[PDB]
Amino acid sequence: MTMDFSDPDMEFLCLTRQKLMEATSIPFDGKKNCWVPDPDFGFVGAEIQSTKGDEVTVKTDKTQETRVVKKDDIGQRNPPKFEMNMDMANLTFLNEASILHNLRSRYESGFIYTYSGLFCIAINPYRRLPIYTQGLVDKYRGKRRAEMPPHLFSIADNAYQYMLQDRENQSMLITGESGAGKTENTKKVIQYFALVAASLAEKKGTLEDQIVQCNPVLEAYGNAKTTRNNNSSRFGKFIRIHFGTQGKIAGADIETYLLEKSRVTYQQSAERNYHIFYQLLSPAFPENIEKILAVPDPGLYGFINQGTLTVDGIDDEEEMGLTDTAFDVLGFTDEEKLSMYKCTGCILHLGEMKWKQRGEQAEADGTAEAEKVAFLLGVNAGDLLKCLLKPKIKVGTEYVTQGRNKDQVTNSIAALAKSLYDRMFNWLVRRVNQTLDTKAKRQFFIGVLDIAGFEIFDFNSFEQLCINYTNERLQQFFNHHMFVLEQEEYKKEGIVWEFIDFGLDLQACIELIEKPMGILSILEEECMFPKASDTSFKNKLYDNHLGKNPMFGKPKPPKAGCAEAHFCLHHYAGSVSYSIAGWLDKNKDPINENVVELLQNSKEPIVKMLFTPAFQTISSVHKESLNKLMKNLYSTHPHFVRCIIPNELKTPGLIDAALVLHQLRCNGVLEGIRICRKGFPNRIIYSEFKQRYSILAPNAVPSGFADGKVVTDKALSALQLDPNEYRLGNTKVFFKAGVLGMLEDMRDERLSKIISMFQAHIRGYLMRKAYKKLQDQRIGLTLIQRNVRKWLVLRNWEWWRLFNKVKPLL
């Protein structure tokens, strides 16, 4: 249904006028054809054979089987007009059976992108597609969403459009589980505007060239191989692009969230560390290994080798060279660059210092390690080790020295590694935001968002709740946006109707988490009394909230596995069971303030890095930044790209119905549909409606003189339809569910009878014509048939035969 249905380019967007005439033409019986439940694709098509109470006996579509599902697992199916439906919201029959169907059908044809009302679905192709060529851009430029086929570029664009026409802000929200490719679309969306909008005005970029190189440099540090995705986004991102009236790009600013601090020093069996250590120890830059004082072999480094050392699809030698380029383009000094490596390296050497103790007194062994570690941070060895092994805390009235045992002196060297990265990440973000700030007038912005959706797992700790709380918001910002827009729309058509902002719904979960004395709040207290115990932390929590705020409860168990849970924070997605598992340690950054203070002296980045300018609770900072986002997001037109992972095995065309149908139920896709339904989810534009159901009731009045709204109204009244089922507006007629279903039905069942009638006027023309002939031929015959009989009675009459020869006798 969109511009040159036979464009080579549309090979993955739409079908052909031919191919779609096919899906749409396959048989159907709204009494026989349906949707049923199944073990391997969740649902499958069916033709009802028999019925006996509940024992409905169905023969499926493909298989040829005959199960006997009870009645209720017999889903209603959409008629052929809808096969390949481009926007999920126009389905007369709303159900998972369908939503799933509309989806893989489209998916197994090469169609990843696909709309459903306000949301635009994506499903990881897992394979280069041509969908994103420049020429496609143009084709997609300027157009309202329905003039073209479903595609990121429209959503990217209409966003851009509305930015201009409405002189207001634009936010694009990409979601979905892990490895469902939201970082993939993001840089598309971003790469889009970089062309559409680019301006007209040594080793350095261009404001647009630069907006783009953010990824390399960020990802060489933010991403790392994970079981679900080899290029996992280990963090949240909100980038924002500012446009100057004229509508060109004025600069952008970046926001990052929840850096997984833990892989710095820890890596699961299969997994890996931030792609950058691997890119450094790469053959790509020889001297560089020298400068960060290291040796070409990601194997020797305790902080790197605990899992992999390579990813199925990555050429770490290239990446680096690429990464080293995003630097130059972003305009960083050779020196600034070195500085960002040596730090990366110190994280190597850290994990290579070995300790030994002689009574709670650990001791270096190979000063050799720390010596390097020392040369990177620009401080000094002995002074470093000291702060490390023996520290002078400050017990209120005094500064005491103390003894640190190997476990301690070790655990300590971790934090310092996990702290020096975080710092380094931030400085790196901080340093880009610095180049993406041209300072040129800024009317508005479109801001993109890559971020996990709710992370609900089998074992749930802190880092879990963080993210879950995050989308806990984002979920109501949506529920909000909807409420508004849905109410506005029913005004534009003037259809009386009452609603309710469901964001209110998510308000408990969210308060308890952030309110003055709920979870995170209490977590700040505990986090503050050295004499702090995790057991301590659940006493305060349990106490305050226990059976006193519903959204807080007793955690469910595993078997003798996973581990001990404590309070179940019922959410949006579902409900999670959380682990007190040492959030206090997790939350607050530790670190020999002794070392801290010794660092505040040295070599620069070190300086900026530890040179502050009490609240590092990974949480305080998150609630801080989380807001800075919601203010931004409620100041924008929200736009939703809902990413989806097709299946585990990283494979092209393949639907783990089970998995997919899972996401559909914690995305919000099945919620809009659930909500719309107790509304008029079917909204038809008067013209369109005339062109299709007039046949049900028609007349003599030429079409160009008839008025749409009038037709529709005549067409329904005649049919007897309940007024309950529709609302006729100023521009659309609003229908409940089954309406477009029945209409379609009553229709084909009409067109049929109509053509029979023609063929009945034809069987009447023709029969009438010979009626002429058999009217004549009956005269001929009764003639024959009455003379030939008269004759039989004379050929033997003596008088007669006489008269006969005596006749010529004249």
């Binding site: 003639l783 048939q785 003379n787 008269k790 050929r795």
Partner: protein, 145 residues
């Protein structure tokens, strides 16, 4: 159709005239005998005296017309009859097929019975398996072999 006709009557008129020239007295058998004599064959008695009494009193002319009428009530004009046959042939030549004509007079219309469909062949112009319609027509009144 039925009970009268101009030429037809006059022909029975002149017809009734070649019979009494064998005497203006309506000189009957004497000339029934004598009118068959100029034709080509010899007739028994009993017929001469039964042929005549198929009529009661006397075969005067008016009456000569009555024995003839009760026998010609449908002898519909010629072309009205030559065309009938034309309707079920529209082949062009002058014929209706045996096979056809047979369903025709026997199944359709005021259905012909076996006894009549039979007689219908004894004298019938059916040579080679077709049927010259312009003859049972010619054999309407009469003409040839």
């Amino acid at each position: 159709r039925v009970k009268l006709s101009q030429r037809q009557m006059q022909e029975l008129k002149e017809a009734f005239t070649m019979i009494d020239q064998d005497r203006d007295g309506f000189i009957g058998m004497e000339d029934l005998k004598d009118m068959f004599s100029s034709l080509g064959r010899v007739p028994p008695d009993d017929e001469l005296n039964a042929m005549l009494k198929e009529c009661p009193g006397q075969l005067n002319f008016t009456a000569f017309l009555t024995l003839f009428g009760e026998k010609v009530s449908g002898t519909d004009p010629e072309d009205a009859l030559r065309n009938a046959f034309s309707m079920f042939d529209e082949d062009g030549q002058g014929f209706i097929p045996e096979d056809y004509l047979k369903d025709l007079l026997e199944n359709m219309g005021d259905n012909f019975s076996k006894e009549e469909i039979k007689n219908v062949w004894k004298d019938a112009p059916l040579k080679n398996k077709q049927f010259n319609y312009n003859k049972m027509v010619d054999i309407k009144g009469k003409a040839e072999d």
